[PDB]
Chain A
Amino acid sequence: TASIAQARKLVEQLKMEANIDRIKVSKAAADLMAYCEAHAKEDPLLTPVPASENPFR
C-alpha cells in the first residue's frame, strides 16, 4: 500500500498549495519592472564605469 501512502501525501500537498493568495501577473510584472528601473543607475554591468572607478580596468 506504499502508493496509497504516497498519494495521501500528494493530495495533502496539493490541497495546501491550492490555498495561495495569488495576484495578477500584471502587478508582478509592474513590480519587477519598477525594481529594475529604480536601480538601473546602480548596475555597473548595465551602465559602464570609467577606468578610474573600475577596479578591473
Chain B
Amino acid sequence: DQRNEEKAQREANKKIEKQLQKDKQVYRATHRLLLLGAGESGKSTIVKQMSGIFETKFQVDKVNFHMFDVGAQRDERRKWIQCFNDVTAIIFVVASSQTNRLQEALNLFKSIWNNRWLRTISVILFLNKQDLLAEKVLAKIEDYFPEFARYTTPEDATPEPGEDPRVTRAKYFIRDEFLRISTASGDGRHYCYPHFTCSVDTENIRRVFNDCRDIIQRMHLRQYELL
C-alpha cells in the first residue's frame, strides 16, 4: 500500500520542481545591488531618486534591478556583510563635503575591497555632495591629507567649463585616493567605478546601468581570455 504514498510524493515533487523552474528563471533574470553608506552621505536622496533591511526595485530598459538598503543593523558589520557575496556590485556612497569622515570612508572601502568573501565584487563609487566640497575649498584637505599639497589635476580630467580648478583638483584627489586602494589588488577580478554626483540627480540610474554592463562584460571577456 506504500506504492500510493510513493506516487503521491512523486506528484508533489513534480509540482514543486515546476514552480522551482519558474522561480529559477525569474531569479536568474534579476541583478541584485547592495547600497552602503548611511551617515552624512546622501544615501536616502539617491534612494528616493531610484526593519533590518529595505528593498527597492526598478527597471532600466526592461532590465530588472533589486537594490538592498541596510536598515536597523549595529555598527559591527563584519558578520552581517558576508550575506552579500553574490551581488553584482556594491554601491558605495561617500560624501566629499567633526572628525575625518573621508578617512573613515576610505578605511571601510579598504576593508570591503580586501575581504575574502567580497574580493570578487566590483564597487560603484559615488562621491556625493560635490557642491559642499566646492564651497569649502573655495573659502580643508591639507589638514587631513597633507600629500594633497603636491597633487595636480591630471591630464584626462573632464571638469565642467564653470568649475574652479581648486574644486577640480580636490575632487580628483579624492577620486584618486579611492582608486589608489582599488588598484592595489584584485588581479582584475573586480574594479572600482567612481562617479561625481550631486545629492539630487537623474543620471544615477543610467550610471548604475552602464557600470553593471561594464562589470558583466568584463567578467565575460575574462572568461574567454579576451581581457
Classify A-B as touching or not with yes or no (CB < 8 A).
no
Query: Which of B's residues lie within 8 Å of A, judged by CB?
Result: none
Query: Which of A's residues lie within 8 Å of B, judged by CB?
Result: none
